[model samples]
Target chain A: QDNSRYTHFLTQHYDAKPQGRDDRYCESIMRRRGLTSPCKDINTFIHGNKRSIKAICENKNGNPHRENLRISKSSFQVTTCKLHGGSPWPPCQYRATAGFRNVVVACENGLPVHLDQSIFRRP
Target chain B: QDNSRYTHFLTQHYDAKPQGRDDRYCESIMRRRGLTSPCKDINTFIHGNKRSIKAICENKNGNPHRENLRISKSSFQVTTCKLHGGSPWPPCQYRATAGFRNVVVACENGLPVHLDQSIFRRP
Candidate 1:
């Protein structure tokens, strides 16, 4: 193959700020409530029946919060393979993918930060 | 709120090799035709109403050819910006976006290369 790759970008912001300076909590909230500080833009194709990435936020009890958010995205086309030698997918082999990622925080001045809670695990 | 960003990657391949040494035609075929020499894998969310990216390959006459291809993709979440003036999107602010990029070929040796087309425009 000639070798080409698709490049995509997404950015999002929030209206209200956090209460505590807990970096972990902040980071968790960021990825959890995707609407706040999460990447709002998305682009890509689906290859197989595989599910898309999920990004959602919940309360300490794992219940949905008004401010909570969730997002799902993909980065590959659908393909089918002879899974267990059953049959060839209507069209495709398997699917190729990349970027169902967590995150790392750095200050505008480039200082590493932390998310105060395992709130990410809460959901 | 804290900050967050989404990262995505797409890769694709084909069973055949493109003919000719024409890099332009090759690249065009890659993005346009897409199936061949294009990123087959896909992933991402949708935001707002901007049409997704278009990746289709037609003949010199702009007609669809089986071997030729086309692909459409997106990289943003949905958000309503009261365009002109309207009710909030079901429920949410506007969305943000990034990474709708074209290709820049650089060799492993770091040599910038050229695509042979633009057969007329550049002159």
Candidate 2:
């Protein structure tokens, strides 16, 4: 099956906490998360329990053909970052910051189906 | 956890059948499989059952910290391909072919830990 859209999306949000707080964080993360090669200029990672994330999609949409169907909505921290224009290789530049937000996710089995928008602030 | 080594390895190995029997197959597969950027010049994808692949690593080595530990040796088809010069974007040229082979893989909690190796032919 051509599930690139799903795979690529999860890889981006499946929270991997930054190792340090610095300008190089994005550089390290973009590569570590398999987002290199010119690097992804814009990216976001969601920090929440996988179960809850899957639970968010529960009862919303059901696809019997899909395995590991689950979804959840919860308040979790998010890190948004971007790559700098000056470089694309080692020392690859990226600037990033983190904040808390509410997120909705849909999953088939254990894999994310698609991410719903996360409000910047709690309503 | 900087599991890039594991994720990067599986993303390359997890079987994604090429869509066509043409020079463009590699280009399509590579992009579809999330291997772009400078576009991985060299890459391989395995065609096999995830359970059996995990079974291959069984009884081989055990790491308690690892979650879903399993391994298996199985016969499966593999496609090895590479990108061509003078291209890194649309119509990215990639030459590839498929063949039957034996592969060994290790998975921790449904996620591949590391790929042992695949003998080009039965040993």
Candidate 3:
């Protein structure tokens, strides 16, 4: 699929904020953003701008799996995963989150398409 | 909504391995485990013994969210999530993995129901 299409999908469905951090963020957003019914996991929401993201994809950052794959960007997605700690229902606390960081993304055909990994640059 | 039922679900579906880690593990397993179509995220598969897990559920570890929510168990499920790093579809590379660790679980009615959190305790 087109990187732009996927980027758009992530922005629309999984975008999150670092402020107002709460235990219920995943539960609330996954349901509101249409990822519930069976709850999604390992999902990320970029806090950066789409224009810059698109630029990263268009620039072509070398091969697909090279190290230090850098992108001059800011305000990244909040990554969250559902934790299988113990309980199995709502009000369950098996979820965890990572705060803001500079991210490394994988792009294709002049569009930032998917995330490779995020580096903890700072808070 | 029983913990046993959910535990069975995780075992039957999301069970993964630390030995054969691969890029395609999520792609192959999610499809095989019936989490595709929409492709599930933040899902887990315990690598430990179910009998011991069930015992944890029966133990009732104080209030839901407390410290050192430990369990006397061995082995564990593999946890996987659909990472939205860049691409929008298959052959995407935004996904990631974490190795085996001691976990904190939330249980209900003599059965480990859901995963609360996992601690990276020594490997």
By lDDT, is 1 or 2 better?
2
The per-model lDDT (C-alpha) reads 0.22, 0.56, 0.47
Model 2 ranges off by over 4 Å: A2-7, A59-72, A86-91, A104-111, A116-123, B1-123
DockQ of 3: 0.02
The candidate maximizing lDDT is 2
Q: Candidate 1 DockQ category?
A: incorrect
A100 Cα displacement, candidate 1 (Å): 15
Supply the TM-score of chain A against the true chain A for every candidate structure.
0.17, 0.61, 0.57
lDDT per residue as tens, model 1, A1-120 = 121111111122221223432333333433454423223221122222211211212211112212322222222221111112233332111221221112212111111122111212
C-alpha lDDT (0 to 100) for residue A46 of candidate 3:
61
RMSD of 1: 23.2
Model 2: how far residue A49 lies from native, Å:
2.5
- The clash count of every prediction, one per candidate, is 53, 23, 36
User: Alpha carbon lDDT of residue A72, candidate 1?
Assistant: 25
Q: Give me the displacement of residue A111 in model 3, in angstroms.
A: 51
Candidate 2: CAPRI quality band = incorrect
